[PDB]
Amino acid sequence: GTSKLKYVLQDARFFLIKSNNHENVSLAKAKGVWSTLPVNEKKLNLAFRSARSVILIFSVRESGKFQGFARLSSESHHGGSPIHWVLPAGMSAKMLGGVFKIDWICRRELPFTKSAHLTNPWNEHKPVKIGRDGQEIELECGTQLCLLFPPDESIDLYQVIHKM
Ligand SMILES: CNc1ncnc2c1ncn2C
């Protein structure tokens, strides 16, 4: 079913994550963490305080797909055991030093061809696949985008609901 998923997405905020490589999304799925540039770090920390759920929706650049979506379970935190991110050019380890814990809600992919009917009012009504890393996605668009993903039957949202 989809009722707990809908409950998690109730009045959530949604942010588009654009990764320059597959390796870091695979690491994020394995280790339950994400890091972003300081300008986005600040926005996510603020939104983590503001809403029942903050949802990250991941797309690897040039893949033509989303790779899944996850819910922030913490604010960012610096200085722990370093995450072995593959660093994009011009991106240093210090720039990505803030670590967010995340709980994955869906690790299945969705091709851009299936979201062509969803546009994001916070990005000039462009198709929701279009956007820079950290672009916020409006509530209705974000909800519908998440509901388009194939079910991930490996996930139990019972614990995530307890964190809300
Ligand atoms: C682990 N964070 C990241 N990895 C790869 N690329 C990124 C990232 N953040 C923003 N961009 C463009």
Swiss-Prot record:
Positions binding RNA in this chain are: K18, S19, N20, W34, S35, W85, D133
| Sites bearing Phosphoserine, chain numbering | S81, S92
Q: Where are the transmembrane segments?
A: none
Q: What is known of its domains?
A: The YTH domain mediates RNA-binding.
Outcome of swapping R132F: Reduced binding affinity for N6-methyladenosine (m6A)-containing RNAs by 9-fold
Write out the PTM section of this UniProt entry: Tyrosine phosphorylated.
Residue ranges constituting the YTH domain according to the UniProt record: 12-149
Task: Please state what the protein is called.
Answer: YTH domain-containing protein 1
Q: Where in the cell is it found?
A: Nucleus; Nucleus speckle
Q: What is the effect of changing R132A?
A: Reduced binding affinity for N6-methyladenosine (m6A)-containing RNAs by 100-fold
Instruction: Relate the outcome reported for changing R132D.
Output: Does not affect ability to influence alternative splice site selection
- Coiled-coil residues are none
On subunit structure and binding partners, the annotation says: Interacts with SRSF1. Interacts with SRSF2. Interacts with SRSF3. Interacts with SRSF7. Interacts with SRSF10. Interacts with CPSF6. Interacts with KHDRBS1/SAM68. Interacts with TRA2B. Interacts with KHDRBS3. Interacts with EMD. Interacts with RBMX. Interacts with ZCCHC8.
Q: What is the effect of changing L56E?
A: Does not affect ability to influence alternative splice site selection
**Stated role:** Regulator of alternative splicing that specifically recognizes and binds N6-methyladenosine (m6A)-containing RNAs. M6A is a modification present at internal sites of mRNAs and some non-coding RNAs and plays a role in the efficiency of mRNA splicing, processing and stability. Acts as a key regulator of exon-inclusion or exon-skipping during alternative splicing via interaction with mRNA splicing factors SRSF3 and SRSF10.
Q: Which residues of the full protein are shown?
A: 345 to 507 of 727
